[PDB]
Every structure is written in structure tokens, then in C-alpha cells.
Symmetry: D2
Subunit: 296 residues, 4 copies
């Protein structure tokens, strides 16, 4: 039968019991990093990549809290839809849950607990999303590559293997929780078998693209900060890091209102209304300052 | 016998958007939910029957977190504050819970630390008549109830958020009352800023010579949770203590255990669901380590 | 009468390159030089005659920083440790300074904080015979002198950096001795790792039943300065206390002032050269504020 | 009479009494930021700009400590010379003190207490130093522009005024403590008169270049961190910021040995020797890892 843009997914489900009891009353991706909820950072990340149709995947328990926080996205020039993940059966599951949302479009997956910062981050995202076929991932040098998907490179910089949490990592380059995919991903994810843990592995997805000669791995250099939210200690460092940048600059990191404003998905009048309910705190005052300041 | 209340109500829009999705006192300070700290404080004071007051939206979540308390040897109840009309409203909402008993109120977002905290709370809770509060030296007393002392160290006035504070001594968020507080609370009128003021309660006792203001010395940490920057500093402070010591601040299960409100067997069971993380490992280690 | 020693000697190459240019105990923890903290500790213990031992390179700089002590009502002297041959060498270098008197040793990079620290030090310094030390629960006891206690709480062994620690109780860097320590130090032989061990001194008193090990409870902060990460945590801990309180930890001038070793007029003069910064402003405010 | 590259200056003199008593025993620029002395960061910054001949200006009291720390630079492929600043008479004084060092060459001034971090920092420095005439400065958005030299821009992005610590800043763009100059600077600095404070102002120097149509002002964007070392509080945040980046990555910020190595001012054998004396700590172990790791 005859036939004739990129959608975003934020996976913000269960971190199981790993951070209990801190996370007994709410999901991790609603905990604040400094002044804003965690999910603002990966959300702003998708927005920075130019993505406006976004699916937020969470637990059944917490979907209402995400919905209360973010609405349908139309205040920030977005359309946000919602899906639930009954059981934390792995990251690749986002594509089965997100199958009808994705449709026949390209996609991007971002972990709902991943924080990024740096210069020309916009352009780094822009190059990944412009690649219309294949998958694109980012490799970041870390102290503890054993905890991550690890990329092995040959002498000419070419990616030649991927291993999920190897005990003896071939390099210190970890695959970050930000992923760009073409229209082949749903089918790749549908045919995965659970790993020995009992999860549908994103690293198997990425390996399938690697075996087709269609995985781009770009370096996210050391001049970027890819922050750890894995532990209570790392969470605290993430808050301190953002607080230090924000107090130094009088500018915010991953303020979604700002990113919409600079993308011109919202205008001055719209942003002025969003500042009204928050006028008596620093966040609404910050939104108001953005209306009459040129920031390069 | 003394009953406890934790007022863990709404902090307006002051910390939005971080508190949009959920109330402050369910956010963590480092490894545990903020409310673990004031709950632990009441438990250290020997108080086992405790009323938790939160917004109507968040009461299910406090309930889900803490249950009826029986697993930690407590008897928890729950009640709602529909609107943030002032801290003294705790005694009106809590009137039937209190009954004819002595009471203590702690604010749901106040963190305490220090040597002999147990005996400081115990000397306040043993005082069967009158009211006991604590005064603590702060940088910014305008934000609090401010105690003025005469040259003999005797408290002579209390002012709520004065524009010109008389000293740097702030009343902490921890209050012990006798059987008169309910009746004093019932007679309160709203202040200029629309609230039933805990400070007017304390002023009623001060006017009868019945307010014991004890100094919480500079060797105690009373931590600030009122701003994003201070919520952060507190996490860092707790983390530095717990990583130095291999011991936890305000772990309710440990406090129950050392009060002997639960025995070894029950603590073992509590450590089971969390066995794979540090928090349950910590509980397990408490069974066979002597900590002075 | 009891004399003090601060051992502020070399920490090898362990923290290089940060300590290449200058010794650790002249680096700041937040607003003040590390040594202000242990010096303040000795002063809180009532000790006014104090010997500062540093490397030969850095003694001029300790001298330049602190002078003879007379401006703060102290009597400071100085001596050198040519090589880091162990903490017990303090008593050999310090032999003639000590004379026939009681002594206390504090390590130059140890930070203490807590309620009733004054009375904890005072009960140790009042014990005119034997030796008093403090045991503190830590995560990593292998790094320290480790106390083992029997079931009655009585100390029964000390091991320096054991591979298999018997408890989590570390001996802190703060030691009170009677008139026997010099003679015990003189008889020490170097350990396998080439040092005159403070732990062998304490073991000599333990074998005579003369070692008082008191618990420094979990409500005290004994902060770690041994790593870059811990030096940082300490700055953050001090900063959080001082910014919350508008009061300083281990300001020597305040301690002198409250001991009444200097009077109002002398404190005023001390606040003059620093008047344009917070540290001198702080000193000036101490003249006309009552702090309990 | 007939005639026929860029030198660096680090100003690391007195911060007066402002941080006393912390700075009573040593100068500020020898205090560590996390694991390394402060002066390593601006030094590495000059090295990143490709500058190998560098003059360190300090107090007479502390010149030996700087010399003990850094030597003559030949271990790191540099030549380091030393000068003293008897009295803290302003930043522009570096050019009178440095006059014979500079000679007839181009120059760069960096404050000895300035910390920078970000992606493509190398390329940002490269563009400033390639400009062979005029001066080049960097403008950075900050919360407290009143404390700094402030750049005013017109509607087309063009710099039109500079004011030193204005009470009512025309923008939030502060001039950073990193400056590139052509051969005119010594003469400009010689003819300055002290300000009402009694200092030779770097902002007057920069204004003189602006009045000649020869000041380039480039934006150092918000994706860079220009950290504050002005206060005990900011110092502590600077240490936390570096510690968080370093523990996350297993890579160092402004390790001078590394920068020399990557510039190829030193070779593998030379770097191996520099690791020998530090082998039992993390810093020497880090130098050793750099010998057999490819880091992009
Ligand atoms: C610091 N960054 C940042 C930047 N650069 N910007 C400016 C910006 C926003 C949108 C566009 Br279109 C181009 C520039 C912003 O408004 N908020 C930001 O957080 S970032 O590009 O590194 C970043 C963006 C989104 C999430 C996390 C980091
Ligand atoms: C550090 N403190 C503390 C202490 N002291 N203890 C020991 C202890 C617990 C219960 C009892 Br009856 C006696 C001693 C504990 O198990 N957990 C603690 O967090 S504390 O008394 O300052 C404290 C207790 C509760 C909440 C906040 C601080
Ligand atoms: C916070 N502490 C402290 C206290 N408590 N005081 C008050 C004080 C000082 C001297 C005396 Br005689 C009695 C009380 C002070 O002036 N400075 C302090 O730093 S402390 O006793 O825990 C302490 C003292 C000295 C070094 C480190 C901590
Ligand atoms: C994080 N940065 C950094 C980087 N990028 N590098 C890598 C690098 C070093 C030299 C060259 Br030629 C090209 C790349 C490094 O070895 N150490 C560094 O600190 S940086 O460019 O932002 C920087 C360099 C020097 C001082 C402060 C920051
Ligand atoms: Cl980079
Ligand atoms: Cl105290
Ligand atoms: Cl204690
Ligand atoms: Cl940028």
C-alpha cells in the first residue's frame, strides 16, 4: 500500500530502591537539583536540540506529579504527552511504550536524571539531530567507566566495540544518557531479549546500529560537565555545581522558559505571563529580567 | 506523658519550582527525607505518640512514607492544615489529639545536631508546668521570633520578625508546652500578616512568668532550610558528618532501637528491604556494633 | 599548671603539589589559618604557654603569623622537627619547654567542634595524674590509633594503623599527659615504619592502668584534614556554621577575650588593623554583644 | 637607526589585607584550589594560549615560594622569569615592571587568581592571540558587574564604553582578568595617572585601545566557568567546582604537566620523570596514566 522531524522521550521512571529512603515519597526525577526539579535539565536538553513533541515516561504512581509540574507543555511552546512504565524492565523499553507516540518519525531518548552543561552545547546537539539516518551517541571520559556502557576506539578514532558495565573497561569513555535514533529503533527494540539482569539494554540497541555501520559516536569533550546523579553524594555535588554557576553568572542552567523564549517558541508577552505567578521569588524575577536584557 | 506534633505544612510559592511537584518536608536532606530529622528529634525527646500535619494534597504521601509508626515503636496519626494560617494553628487542628496531655511542637523542616541533644530535650520535656523554648544565635534574626534578654540573662520580650531586632537570638522551631497551650491558641487573633502566631503563644507564657528560654549554644548546629542555598548547605553538613563517622544523623530506626522501643529482631527485619543499599547495611551493622 | 605543644610538622609529599610551596597548617580552613583551630583548642583548655613545632623551613612563617603570643595573652615559643620521625618526637624536642610540668599535645591539623567542648577539655586537663585521650567513632579506623574496649566499656588495647581494626574507635589528635611522658618518650624505639609512635606512649600508660580513654561522642565534629577532599569538606563545614550563626569557630582573639586573658581595650586594638574586612568587624562586634 | 610571538605575565602580588588572616602567612595565589596551587590555573591558561616565555610578578616576600614551586619552567618546556611588586599600585603596573621582559614583543596579562574552564577554551584563546595588533579582552556575564570593569554594547553587539566598578552598571558583562596586547601597551601604561584610589587601572589601558578603534571584546559565553576567587566563600566554591569535575572525569583541570605534554613542549620520557617524585600520590599517578591513554 502506497505512502507518499524528531520526537523526544524522557525516561523518568523508577530508580528502584537504590536511593531509598530519600526516594520513598517521590521519584528521583522530581528531586531538585539546586533550585529546579531534576527533570527540567533533560527537558531543557531536548528543547535545546529543537525538539517540541516530547513523551514523558514515568511510574503510574508519579505520572500525576509530572503532569502537575509540566502540563501539556503549551506554556513553553511544547506538546507533552505521558506514558507509564509499570515495571523498570530497562531503558530500551521506552521504544515499545513510546511506539505509537514515535510513529514513523525520528527520535531522541534522554534519561530523566542526566545533567549536561557547556559551551556550544546547542551546536553539539544540532550535529547529532541533523543526522537523519543511523543512531548518534555521545562518549564522555569518566573516572568509573565500569558503571556505564563503554566505547572502545581503534587507533584512528573509530568506534569498534560497546560493552555494558565491563569489569575491565577498554577505555574510560562512557556512553551518556542522551541518544538520537532514526526510524529503525522501534524494530531493533522489539526484537531485543532481556539481559541476564532482566532488562532491555540500550547498549544492545546501540550495538545493533554499530553492526550496521550506522552508529556515530561523538566525543563530548572534557570542557563539558556531564554530572552524576547516581548517588546521594553525587546529587549533592550536582546541586553545588549548578548553584556555583548560577550565583556567579546571574544566569540559569536549564530554565525551560528561557530556552523556549530563545528558540522563539514563546514571545515576550507569553514569558511575561509565566513570570507573574513566580514574581515574589528569584525564579519569576529571573524570568522578568530576561524580557529587557540582551544576553549573548 | 507528652505528645508530639510535627507541622510539615506548605511553604507557599517561596521555593517554586522545586516544591511545585511536592512539599519541602518530603525532599531529602542527603540520604533521608527532611521529616526524618524532626521526627527523630521528637523520638530523642522520648515522645512516641505523634501527629503529623501536612497540606491536604501531601498527607497521603506522609502516610505512605511513615505508616502508623508501629514498625518503629511509635503511634502516628495524621491531620491536615488546609491553608498556611500560622504555626499556632497546629494546636487547634491538634486539639483532640493533644487531649489533656503535655505537648511538643517541632517544625517539619528544622534540623538539629549536637552533643547531649538528648539531655537538652529531656530537661525541657521533664518541666511539667509552663513552656520551654530554645534561643540560638543567628546572623539574621529579623527572619525569626527574636528573644530580648536583660543583663541578668532573663528573657523580657519576644518579637516576631522585627525590622529592628533587639538581639541576635532567634527562637528555634521546637516547642514544649503544658496543658494551657490549646486554650491560649483558641484565644489568638490573626496578626497583621494574617496568621495565628506561635510567638503570641510564647508571649502569653512569658507574661505569666512561665516561659523558660534556654540557650541552645553555639556548639549545636540548628540548620537553615529556608532557601535553596541553605537546603544545600544542610545536605553537605549532614554528608560530611556521616562520611567521617560511619554513623547517621537522625535515622529514626536507630533512635527507636536505642530507646528500646524496638528490639534486635524487629531492627533486623527493618534492615531486610533495604539490604542492597547503604541505609539497610547501616541498620544491619547496628545489631552487632557497640556505639557509645 | 599545664603547658601545650602544637605539632605542625611536615605531611611528606602526600598533598603535593598543593603543599609544595608551604606547609599544610598555614593553609586556611575557610577564613583562618589551619593552626588557629588547634591553638584555639589549647586556649579553650586553659593553656597559655605553648610550643609550636614546625619544619625548619616554615618556623619563621609560624613566628611571623603568631609572634610571641603576648597580644592574645599567651606566651608562645617555637621549635623545629628536622624530619618527620613520628608524633612522640614532640616530647623529645619539647623536653626542656615541658620541664617538670603537666603537658598537652594537639596535632596542628586537627579541627574540633561541639557543645561543652570547654568542659570536655577541662575535665581531661584537671586530671593531674596519668594520661587522657579521646576515642571517636570513624568510618575508616585503619588510618589511626585504634582503641579496643571490653564489654564494660574499659579500654584494653591500642593498635597503630592495624590492617584488621578491633573497633571503629580512633584516638583523636589531642593528648593530655602528666610528668611521665618525657621519660616514656625517651625510652621509645622507632617502629617498623621508622617512627617514634604516639600510640606506644599511650600504650605505656594503658599497661600501668593510667590511660583514661574518654569517648568523644557523635555530637562532636572531629574533622578530617588528611586529603584534598576532606580539607574541602572542613572549609564547607566551618563556613556553614559561621554563616548561620554570625559567630566564629576557633577565633583565638575571642577565646583569649572570654578567658579574660585580654581585656576590652586590647581586643579593640586587635580589631583595628583588620577593620575593613569581616574578621576585624567580627572582633569589634564582640566588644558590645553579649553571646551566651 | 635602522631595524629589520607573545610573552606572558602573571600578576600574583598582594591581595592586601582583604583575606586576612587566612592570607597572613602566604600569598593568595599559592593557596590551593582543591588539589593544586591557585597559580597553576592561570599558568596553564597562558600555556593553553601557546605562551612559553612568562614573567611571574609577586611580592618580595613571596617570590622565593613561587620560585620554589615553579623553577625556571624548563621541566614543563617553559622559560619563567621573576619580578617583584613592592607596592600594590594597580594591575597596569605589570607593564612598567615587565617592560624589559616584554621588549618589542606582543604580550598577554593574566591575573594570578583567575580560574577558567570550558569547551574549546583553547580555540577561544587562539583567536585572541592571533590578533597581532590592538588589544583583546573577554566579556563575561556576572551577577555583580559593579565589582568589575563593565563593557557597554550598542544594538549591533559593538563595544562602546568601559567603566571601572560603576555603581549603576550599563550591563552585566564584566571584563575578565585575561588580556592580550600588541606593542603599544607599555607606552599606554607609562602615561597613565593613578586613579582616585591610587592605582594604575587596567580599565584605562583598555579604554585607550577602545578610543583608537583597536579593542576587540569577545564574549566568553555562559558555557564557560569564570570562577570567583574574591572571597573565602567563593574560594571554597572554586575548590568544590574543580573537585566535582575532576572526580567525575578522572581528568584534571590546569595540570601544567599535561598541557606541556599535549602542546608537545615535553615528550613521553620527560613526563615520565616528572611523575617519579609524585608516584605515591594521585597527582603523580595521574601523570603516569597520561603516558598510555588516548584522551580526546
Ligand atoms: C548553559 N546552557 C544554556 C544556554 N547556553 N542557554 C542559552 C541558549 C538557549 C537557547 C538557544 Br536556541 C541558544 C542559547 C540557556 O538559555 N540556558 C542554558 O542552560 S547549555 O547550552 O549548556 C544547557 C542548555 C539546556 C540544558 C542544559 C544546559
Ligand atoms: C547525632 N545525634 C544522634 C545521636 N546522638 N544518637 C545516639 C543516641 C540515640 C538515642 C538515644 Br535514647 C541516645 C543516643 C543517634 O542514634 N542518632 C543521632 O542522630 S543527635 O542527638 O544530635 C540527633 C538526634 C536526632 C536528630 C538529630 C540529631
Ligand atoms: C564553637 N566553639 C567555640 C565556643 N564554644 N566559644 C565560646 C567560648 C569560648 C571560650 C570560653 Br572560656 C567559653 C566559651 C568560642 O568563643 N569560640 C568557639 O569556637 S568550640 O568550643 O566548639 C571550639 C573552641 C575552640 C576551637 C574549636 C571549637
Ligand atoms: C578543561 N581544560 C583542559 C583541557 N581542555 N585540556 C586538554 C588540552 C590541553 C592542551 C591542548 Br594544546 C589541547 C587540549 C587539558 O589538558 N587540561 C585542561 O584543563 S580547559 O581547556 O578548559 C583549561 C585549560 C587550562 C587551564 C584551565 C582550563
Ligand atoms: Cl572540550
Ligand atoms: Cl555550646
Ligand atoms: Cl554526643
Ligand atoms: Cl556558551
Amino acid at each position: 500500500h502506497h505512502h507518499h522531524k524528531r520526537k523526544g522521550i524522557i525516561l523518568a521512571g523508577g530508580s528502584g530502591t537504590r536511593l531509598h529512603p530519600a526516594t520513598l515519597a517521590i521519584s528521583k526525577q522530581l528531586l531538585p537539583v539546586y533550585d529546579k526539579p531534576m527533570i527540567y535539565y533533560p527537558l531543557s536538553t531536548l528543547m535545546l536540540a529543537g525538539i517540541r513533541e516530547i513523551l514523558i515516561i514515568s511510574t503510574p504512581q508519579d505520572t500525576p506529579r509530572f503532569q502537575q509540574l509540566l502540563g501539556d507543555g503549551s506554556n513553553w511552546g511544547l506538546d507533552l504527552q505521558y506514558a507509564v512504565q509499570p515495571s523498570p524492565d530497562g531503558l530500551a523499553q521506552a521504544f515499545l511504550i513510546g511506539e505509537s507516540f514515535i510513529g514513523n518519525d525520528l527520535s531522541a531518548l534522554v534519561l530523566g536524571d542526566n545533567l549536561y552543561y557547556g559551551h556550544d552545547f546547542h551546536e553539539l546537539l544540532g550535529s547529532a539531530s541533523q543526522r537523519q539516518t543511523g543512531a548518534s551517541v555521545f562518549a564522555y571520559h569518566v573516572l568509573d567507566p565500569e558503571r556505564y556502557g563503554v566505547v572502545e576506539f581503534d587507533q584512528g578514532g573509530k568506534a569498534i566495540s560497546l560493552e555494558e558495565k565491563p569489569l575491565e573497561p577498554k577505555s574510560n569513555y562512557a556512553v551518556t544518557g542522551l541518544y538520537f535514533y532514526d526510524q529503525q529503533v522501534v524494530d531493533i527494540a522489539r526484537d531485543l531479549k532481556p539481559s541476564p539482569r532482566g532488562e532491555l539494554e540500550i547498549t544492545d540497541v546501540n550495538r545493533a546500529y554499530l553492526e550496521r555501520g550506522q552508529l556515530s559516536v561523538e566525543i563530548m569533550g572534557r570542557g563539558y560537565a556531564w554530572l552524576d546523579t547516581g548517588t546521594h553524594d553525587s546529587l549533592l555535588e550536582a546541586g553545588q555545581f549548578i548553584a556555583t554557576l548560577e550565583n556567579r553568572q546571574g544566569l540559569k542552567v536549564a530554565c525551560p522558559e528561557e530556552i523556549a523564549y530563545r528558540q522563539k517558541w514563546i514571545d515576550a508577552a507569553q514569558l511575561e505571563k509565566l513570570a507573574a505567578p513566580l514574581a515574589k521569588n528569584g525564579y519569576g524575577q529571573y524570568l522578568k529580567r530576561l524580557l529587557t536584557e540582551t544576553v549573548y
